[PDB]
């Protein structure tokens, strides 16, 4: 009865955001174009490939050091290695929880988050349970995020909503629930779905969640132009494995 | 002592398998044909889509009952539901561990496997750490599988080797290691990589693992003829989401 009451309260908060979006939303940029240093500061330089080797992670970390990226993002098995490689730098170690499908038991996601932080993760990017969101099981989706957030209280949790599988209302619902569960960021995509970041999705998400929560744009971000566009429409972070070519394109075409 | 020496013993076993493969291997069928009843009994009727809803899982389970499939395969968040839906039937509930990327900490995989069995799973399809396998970290890969096998003693564990990312010596290594670690099956694919089951892969794996270990062919198996081919070349189980069309396909064209 408490959880059905909370389900009801969540539904009302979603409806209020949907109503406001319908009456007031306008798609427009949040800022003028970003520079090279802004782009570097946004980048979480990523290798989440299942075939990544320890030497690949060593190379990723070196690249993050060389280009002064905000952080690296690696699979959980490589968190201690990235921490070791990055010891003494301010480069953050980000890993992924319940990734990329988001369809693990909640307690698995919570355990994985705890293990990640024990291994030296600074931030967690989790995947939402997309199927249960689409089924309008708001309380399940809320408790699933909440359990991770609580389990690593004090550490940054980002919620990947996986926009490629969502309609507009569901995008809004995912953002509202993520905010209510006490997550610090929402994130567009895993890069393992049918689509990645769009300016439209980034802007909507930033408009719903506000200035106090972050938006991380990821999936398909290949160039300096892609990075600048996502930042221009409200992204605070960029997830990409193309950090090096992004910096090179910026230097070549915009330097 | 234990780890460096286990590393060494595994390398020698892999070398022995590779030597035998080079000396004696022949690609050819293991049986003349398979009929509709054999195919039904091989099929693990699957929905691992991240956007799968409770209703989709209810439909999958109904389809498994109507067609007398061996099992259903679902993500861990739905094991309890599948079990509830299949109560009073002998349809197995299979789930996936460390799936599809295989790059979780070993302890996350082992906990996920335990949590699945507690939630009612009969069998576990885990994903190998592909990157550590490619880096020839045999003891890491071995312990990763061994930890899961032992955590769910008495339940079938299948190791997904993810053939699409592997060369021939790597496929042999993954099979040798899965065998050594006490897994009951090797499985071709996740369906989330760059390729799925081939007859050449199924047959190589069966030849390496032998008569008392299983091979589960998965990924890209869309038709009855696809299903029959894999069985002819050594598959004991078939992972597919196309179970209903596979069966209707064979009934129509073969009786």
Curated annotation (Swiss-Prot), chains A, B:
It catalyses: 2-deoxy-D-ribose 5-phosphate = D-glyceraldehyde 3-phosphate + acetaldehyde. One of its GO terms (biological process) is deoxyribonucleotide catabolic process. Optimum pH is 6.5 for 2-deoxy-D-ribose 5-phosphate cleavage. The active site is at 125 (proton donor/acceptor), 187 (schiff-base intermediate with acetaldehyde), 216 (proton donor/acceptor). The keyword Secreted does not apply. One of its GO terms (molecular function) is deoxyribose-phosphate aldolase activity. Disulfide bonds: none annotated. Pathway: Carbohydrate degradation; 2-deoxy-D-ribose 1-phosphate degradation; D-glyceraldehyde 3-phosphate and acetaldehyde from 2-deoxy-alpha-D-ribose 1-phosphate: step 2/2. InterPro entries: Aldolase_TIM, DeoC, DeoC/FbaB/LacD_aldolase, DeoC_typeI. It is an enzyme of class 4 (lyase). It comes from the Bacteria. Keywords: Cytoplasm, Lyase, Schiff base. It is found in: Cytoplasm. GO terms for cellular component: cytoplasm. Gene3D superfamilies: Aldolase class I (3.20.20.70). Its EC number is 4.1.2.4. Belongs to the DeoC/FbaB aldolase family. DeoC type 1 subfamily. Catalyzes a reversible aldol reaction between acetaldehyde and D-glyceraldehyde 3-phosphate to generate 2-deoxy-D-ribose 5-phosphate. This is Deoxyribose-phosphate aldolase. It comes from Thermotoga maritima (strain ATCC 43589 / DSM 3109 / JCM 10099 / NBRC 100826 / MSB8). The lineage of its organism: Bacteria, Thermotogati, Thermotogota, Thermotogae, Thermotogales.
């Amino acid at each position: 009865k408490i959880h059905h009451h909370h389900h009801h309260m969540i539904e009302y908060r979603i409806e209020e955001a949907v109503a406001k979006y319908r009456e007031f939303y306008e798609f427009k940029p949040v800022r003028e174009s970003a520079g090279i240093e802004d782009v570097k500061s946004a980048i979480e330089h990523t290798n989440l490939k299942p075939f990544a080797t320890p030497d690949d992670i060593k190379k990723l970390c070196l690249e993050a050091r060389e280009n002064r990226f905000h952080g690296v993002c690696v699979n959980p098995c490589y968190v201690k290695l990235a921490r070791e490689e990055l010891e003494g730098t301010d480069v953050k170690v980000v890993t992924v929880v319940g990734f990329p499908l988001g369809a693990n038991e909640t307690r698995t996601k919570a355990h994985e988050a705890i293990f990640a932080v024990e291994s030296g993760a600074d931030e967690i990017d989790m995947v939402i349970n997309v199927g249960m969101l689409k089924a309008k099981e708001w309380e399940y989706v809320y408790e699933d995020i909440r359990s991770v957030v609580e389990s690593v209280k004090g550490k940054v949790v980002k919620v990947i909503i996986e926009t490629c599988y969502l309609d507009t209302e569901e995008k809004i619902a995912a953002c509202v629930i993520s905010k209510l569960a006490g997550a610090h960021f929402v994130k567009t995509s895993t890069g393992f779905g049918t689509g990645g970041a769009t300016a439209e999705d980034v802007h909507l998400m930033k408009w719903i969640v506000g200035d106090e929560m972050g938006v991380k744009a990821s999936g398909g971000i290949r160039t300096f132009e892609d990075a600048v566009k996502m930042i221009m429409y409200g992204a605070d972070r960029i997830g990409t494995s193309s950090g090096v070519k992004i910096v090179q394109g910026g230097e070549e075409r915009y330097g």
